Design a binder for this molecule. Structure first.
Ligand code: HEM
Length: 395
C-alpha cells in the first residue's frame, strides 16, 4: 500500500519523511490524500524532468452547471493545447503591469500594517504576525494588483476562504455572487481602463489578435486570489520564523539588507509554503527513473524533498542565506518548473523581500514569544504553514 500523504509522520515532518522515500529510491508507490494510488517522485533531477515532460498532464484519467466552467477552467488545471494560449494572455498582462514597479506600493502596505502592530498585542504583550501582518499584506497586494476597491477587501478575504473550503452550503450562495461581482468589475474597467491588472487582462492580446473571454478573465481573478493569498502569507511567516530561530541569519540581514534577494531564494528552498506539485498523469506507458509507469497513473511530485536533495545541494539541511550567489540563476523547485511554473513568483519574491525588509527595519529587536514556533505548525499534506507566530516587538 505504501506511504499515505495523511500519514502522521509525513504531516509532522515532511522533510524527514519524504527525504526517507527520496533516499530509498527515485520512484516509490504510495497513496494520495484520497487513498488514491500515486507514484512519489522526490529527487531534484527527476522532479524537474517530470515537470518538463509533455507526457505528464494535469487532467486526471454540489455546484450548478453554468458555473462549472469557472472552476474547471483554471490555468493550473489546463493542459496543452489549451494551456499555452491562456498562459500567454495572463503573462502578457503581468508584463504590461510591470510587477517590479509595485515595490513602493508593497512597502507602503507593509509599513502601514507594521505601524498598527503594537495595537494588536494580546494581554501577554505578544502579537501574532500571521493574522496582523502576513495575511493582511498578501491579500491587500493581490487585491490591489487586480484593481479590487479597498472597500471590498473584506469581501474578497471571505470569498478567498469560501474558495479554499468549497462547502456547498456556503458556495451555492457566494460563488454566483463573486462571479457576478467580477463580471461587473470587468464591464466597469472596460468602459474606463486604468493601470491595474484587470485592465491589462482586458487589453491583453495574443499574437493572432485573440483575447481572453470575460469568463476566462473572471476565472483568472479567482485563480490569482486562490493561488497567491495563503502561499505568500506563509512564505512570510515561515521565513520570519526561520530567521528568528537562526538568530545569526536575522542579525546578518539587519546588518546587510542588500542580502535580502539572495536570502529570499534560500528561504524559498528551506521553508517555502508549498511542498508538492499538483498531481501529474502519464498519457502513455513510460519508464521513469527505472520504474514502469502505466498510462493513466498518477504521479505526486514532492518539491520539499527535491529542495533538500543532497544530490544537488551541499548540506541541504542547513539554513544558509548566503548559499545562493549574487546573480546566480534560480536554483530550487519551490515555485515549480516548466510550463506551469508559478506565474506569481516575481510578485511573491517581491512580497517576501519587502515584508522582511520593513520588518527588519521597523522591529530590529523582534523576538519569538517564549516557545518553539513549531508548536503552531499545522499538519497539512503538501503544505507548510503556521497557525500563528507569536512575537515580541520590543525588549
Ligand atoms: C510564496 C508564494 C508562492 C508559492 C510557494 C507558489 C508556488 C507555486 C507552485 C509550486 C506552482 C506550480 C504547481 C504545479 O506545477 O503543479 C505554482 C503555480 C501557480 N502560481 Fe504560485 N506560488 C506562490 C505565490 C503565487 C502568487 C502570489 C500568485 C498570483 C499572483 C500565484 C499564482 C500561480 C498560478 C496562477 C499558478 C499556475 C500556473 C500555471 O498552471 O500555468 N502564486 N505556484
Amino acid at each position: 500500500a505504501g506511504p499515505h500523504m495523511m500519514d502522521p509522520d509525513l504531516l509532522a515532518d515532511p522533510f524527514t519523511g519524504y527525504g526517507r522515500l527520496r533516499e530509498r529510491g527515485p520512484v516509490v508507490r504510495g497513496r494520495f490524500v484520497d487513498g488514491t494510488p500515486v507514484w512519489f517522485v522526490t529527487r531534484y533531477d527527476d522532479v524537474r524532468a517530470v515537470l518538463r515532460d509533455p507526457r505528464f498532464v494535469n487532467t486526471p484519467s454540489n455546484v450548478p452547471e453554468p458555473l462549472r466552467v469557472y472552476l474547471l477552467g483554471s490555468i493550473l488545471d489546463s493542459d496543452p493545447p489549451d494551456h499555452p494560449r491562456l498562459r500567454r494572455l495572463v503573462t502578457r498582462a503581468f508584463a504590461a503591469r510591470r510587477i517590479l514597479g509595485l515595490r513602493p506600493g508593497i512597502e507602503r502596505i507593509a509599513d502601514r500594517l507594521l505601524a498598527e502592530l503594537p495595537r494588536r498585542e494580546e494581554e501577554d504583550g505578544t502579537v501574532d504576525l500571521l493574522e496582523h501582518f502576513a495575511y493582511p499584506l498578501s491579500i491587500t497586494v493581490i487585491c490591489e494588483l487586480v484593481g479590487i476597491p479597498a472597500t471590498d477587501l473584506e469581501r474578497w478575504r471571505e470569498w478567498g476562504g469560501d474558495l479554499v473550503s468549497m462547502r456547498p452550503e456556503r458556495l451555492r450562495h457566494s460563488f454566483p455572487v463573486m462571479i457576478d461581482y467580477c463580471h461587473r468589475l470587468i464591464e466597469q474597467r472596460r468602459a474606463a481602463l486604468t493601470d491595474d491588472l484587470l485592465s491589462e487582462l482586458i487589453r491583453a492580446q495574443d499574437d493572432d489578435g485573440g483575447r481572453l473571454s470575460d469568463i476566462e478573465t473572471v476565472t483568472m481573478i479567482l485563480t490569482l486570489v486562490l493561488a497567491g493569498h495563503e502561499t505568500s502569507a506563509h512564505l512570510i511567516g515561515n521565513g520570519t520564523a526561520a530567521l528568528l530561530t537562526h538568530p545569526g541569519q536575522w542579525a546578518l540581514l539587519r546588518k546587510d539588507p542588500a542580502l535580502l534577494p539572495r536570502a529570499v531564494h534560500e528561504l524559498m528552498r528551506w521553508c517555502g509554503s508549498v511542498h508538492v506539485a499538483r498531481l501529474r498523469y502519464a498519457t502513455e506507458d513510460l519508464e521513469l527513473a527505472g520504474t514502469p509507469v502505466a498510462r493513466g497513473d498518477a504521479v505526486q511530485l514532492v518539491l520539499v524533498s527535491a529542495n533538500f536533495d543532497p544530490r544537488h545541494y551541499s548540506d541541504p539541511d542547513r539554513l544558509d542565506i548566503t548559499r545562493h550567489q549574487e546573480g546566480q540563476a534560480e536554483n530550487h523547485v519551490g515555485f515549480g518548473h516548466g510550463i506551469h511554473y508559478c506565474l506569481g513568483a516575481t510578485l511573491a519574491r517581491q512580497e517576501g523581500e519587502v515584508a522582511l525588509a520593513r520588518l527588519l527595519e521597523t522591529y530590529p529587536d523582534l523576538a519569538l514569544a517564549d516557545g518553539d514556533p513549531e508548536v503552531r505548525r499545522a499538519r497539512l499534506p503538501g503544505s507548510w504553514r503556521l497557525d500563528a507566530l507569536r512575537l515580541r516587538l520590543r525588549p
